[PDB]
Symmetry: C5
Subunit: 206 residues, 5 copies
Amino acid sequence: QANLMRLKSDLFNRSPMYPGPTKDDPLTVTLGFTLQDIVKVDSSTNEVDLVYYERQRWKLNSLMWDPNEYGNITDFRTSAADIWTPDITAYESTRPVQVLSPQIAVVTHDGSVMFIPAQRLSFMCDPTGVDSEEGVTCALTFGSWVYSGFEIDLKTDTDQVDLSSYYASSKYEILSATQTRQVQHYSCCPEPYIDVNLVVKFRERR
Amino acid sequence: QANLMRLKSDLFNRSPMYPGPTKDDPLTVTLGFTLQDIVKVDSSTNEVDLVYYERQRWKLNSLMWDPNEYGNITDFRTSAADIWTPDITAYESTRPVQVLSPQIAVVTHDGSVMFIPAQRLSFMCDPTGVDSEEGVTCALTFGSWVYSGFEIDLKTDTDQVDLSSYYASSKYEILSATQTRQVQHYSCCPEPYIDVNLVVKFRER
Amino acid sequence: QANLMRLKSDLFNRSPMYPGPTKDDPLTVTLGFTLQDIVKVDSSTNEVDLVYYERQRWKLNSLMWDPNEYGNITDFRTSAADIWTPDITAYESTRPVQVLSPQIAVVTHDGSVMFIPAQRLSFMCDPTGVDSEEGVTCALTFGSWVYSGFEIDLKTDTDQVDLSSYYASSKYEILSATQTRQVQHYSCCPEPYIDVNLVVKFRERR
Amino acid sequence: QANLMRLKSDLFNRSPMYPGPTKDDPLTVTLGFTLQDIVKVDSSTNEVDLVYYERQRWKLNSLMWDPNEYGNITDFRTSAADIWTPDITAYESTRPVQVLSPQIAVVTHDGSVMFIPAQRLSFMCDPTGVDSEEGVTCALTFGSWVYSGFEIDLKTDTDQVDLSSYYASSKYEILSATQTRQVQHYSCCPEPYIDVNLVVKFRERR
Amino acid sequence: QANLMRLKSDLFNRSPMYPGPTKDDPLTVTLGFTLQDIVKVDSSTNEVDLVYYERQRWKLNSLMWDPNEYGNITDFRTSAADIWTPDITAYESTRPVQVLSPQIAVVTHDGSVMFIPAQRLSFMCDPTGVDSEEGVTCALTFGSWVYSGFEIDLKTDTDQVDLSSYYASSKYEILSATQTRQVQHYSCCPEPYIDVNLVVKFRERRA
Ligand SMILES: c1cnc2cc3c(cc2n1)[C@@H]1CNC[C@H]3C1
Ligand SMILES: c1cnc2cc3c(cc2n1)[C@@H]1CNC[C@H]3C1
Ligand SMILES: c1cnc2cc3c(cc2n1)[C@@H]1CNC[C@H]3C1
Ligand SMILES: c1cnc2cc3c(cc2n1)[C@@H]1CNC[C@H]3C1
Ligand SMILES: c1cnc2cc3c(cc2n1)[C@@H]1CNC[C@H]3C1
């Protein structure tokens, strides 16, 4: 309708796009994972394929507006390509990530954004021991590729990976799955980088 | 011709595109499935591959015209990218859905739209017992990814999946195939989301 | 060359693109198949891979010109994106079609266009009996996805499939291959649709 | 720098792109192949995978300039997308060709263009006898997909395929390889088409 | 915010893009490799699959600015598509490289650029002996596709490849990996071309 088209026109045409966070104006992204399925294990290459959602939230003043000035609209859907999004990357991936869902974000009048893409990922993981009762553990680090912790900071809402949607007939059952903020330095660069470490222990279902 | 060229110009360059449904102007999408073939079963990863087509219908006021003002044209075909389409998604997919058909829709003068994409889909399914005679049952949910039931509702015209085009020499025969609207809640959000549950019982032929 | 640049400019830059055929302005589209190779047969999924050319022909008034007014130019080549092309689709495909040739068409001064995309296609076919001498038969139906026979008058030139390019050393030899216009109705719509039925009889070469 | 940006501007922004050759203005394209590696052989489907360079050369008056008018610049590199390039295609491919190199041409002040993409090609080939000492022979025809002998002629600079940088540690070694111009009819068209026939004889290296 | 938006505007939208290096204005690109994983070895086709990232650095006069003129901005992240990048290519690749990371570069006020794409590469390599103690050695050649040494020169900051991030549970363990500038001629062309030669020695992880 008219107001929403007016609102989206204002936010996206009145101004050039948000150029990303800076040291002067850093951003915090809240990251949470929903694990759908461990689809595949490959012991000839030590790769494991994972289907999951990645819940992302951040807030920008450039996406703020007054609902009264727009027929009481307090939020809207929009293509993730219309707006800036964080370069959150899985560091142990072995193939380009595969997108499983539409890429549409919800923007709220207070400038907050929620974006939840579903993905399939192959990543480095030695599955040796997956057929035992103890199972095997693998770890994933999700973080910004190019922004240090002075520009993008990460946090979680919970330490528990959401398993409420996990496929009950998966070849693999999950014994535990956690998500933990952590920080490290890389050789190339002087500043610390922030990541959320996904640690998943699993085994062959029986 | 010039009447159609004028009408399309008067609809797509006339106004900004439809920004999608809202709670004040919700949209009901009608869905129907035609199952072409169960192509492949993988008992090592619990994936099944389906080829099907999905009939989508919906109606937008912004796509309306008086035919009399355009040489009596009552409907036209156009690229799906020229118009807004619903984000209907298979929730259990394990690979990006592969489109097999041109992405073209028909728009009628009353604003109604019909879009029928053919697709190959890999989804989550334990096919254990497909080699028996009782067969195996798998379930598939299709729904808007980002719109709740206050924004997009869904409907089916029939509970029967259309099987009149099913491959007679498929490696798998279909014992039953239903499509049912249902309401679900998800951990991230408090609102109800609507899906259409595709339940397919099948076995080796 | 200046004449051709000027010609393309007048045909494409001036008026908008042809919006496709309609009930008020039906269009004849001619189809012929040149079968190149049956690459692969999979009896675990009943899928067959075929490599072929699809010769497409049609004619538009909006693409006509008088050669006299353009240095006696009688034809040119142009990107398929510059013009309308028919949505011809293989109905029994199981994977997206893989394009093997450049997407370029030839336009002649009388307005006729020829577009010949080479393609690799996987489709449903039960190859039980391919190893015998009576061989196996498979049917494949090509047609517009969205245009009925009120809009597209689909036809072949000949009923014989062009086999003069078929790979002599293929794993599979062709016993017979026909191409025939047929009229079908579909559940969704009341209009009759036109397709070309491709029937191919083939066996393992020996 | 200044003079080069000015030259590229004057070439690409003043007049539009070369629209391709015609009957009355044909273009001769020179072609050489450099074989890098026969990567793979598939005897269940009669497909062979090849990695090669394709050296293309042609000349356009519309790409000529006076170097003295442009700071003694005699040539320059530019994205292949900024200029017209010929639609050379392998007729016997079974999968879309994969590009392995940047796609950048060199344009020289006399209007001559050199373009050398590296590619991987799956094509129709019977490897029956690849493990013998006499090896097996296969052939590949390369030509414009849509320009006939009236619009594009092809020539080779030599009859011999460049094998000087072939990969010494390939599963397959090359006994001989030739490239030869030939003229051919196709069922669709009365105009003959020119191709270059690549004939390669190889065997498994031991 | 506003200054950053204004700065990017002046660099990209006002001046036409850099047309690349020439003999008159040659360019030096510094390259360094960080090897994450040897995923796969195919002895039926002599291909090896490798996951690595590649650190690239160069400097352009045309990317310089005075920070006091732009709210003290000394650097910024920008899409790799917004700027010129070197056409560094693995010569031995057998598949198109698969990009694993966002394609975002960092540009600094002195005109220097840093770009670190992560990639999966399939390349030609005979892995015979990979299941032995002594292992197998393979060589990769990275260089410009179309610029000779008169237009693009290369260097490493060190001769030792970075192995400290190598996945410890790979199927394959690395014995050594070096990265060395080298000069070559090619049949088609009269000018020397520069590359960094990456030599990796590895074997199957056992015991
Ligand atoms: C700027 C541009 N790209 C970078 C890539 C990486 C890093 C910093 C970068 N800074 C370290 C952290 N993230 C991945 C690699 C290495
Ligand atoms: C806004 C944006 N993305 C969403 C993704 C999902 C959901 C709601 C969203 N709302 C729940 C339902 N649909 C899929 C997942 C979870
Ligand atoms: C408009 C848009 N899409 C359609 C898809 C199909 C059909 C008609 C359509 N009309 C029937 C015929 N062609 C393929 C399927 C079903
Ligand atoms: C116009 C457009 N496409 C064509 C494709 C081919 C041919 C002519 C064409 N002319 C014959 C020669 N080139 C490949 C096939 C057949
Ligand atoms: C200009 C344009 N393309 C080239 C391609 C190559 C070469 C030089 C080129 N110069 C030699 C070096 N790079 C790869 C091949 C061969």
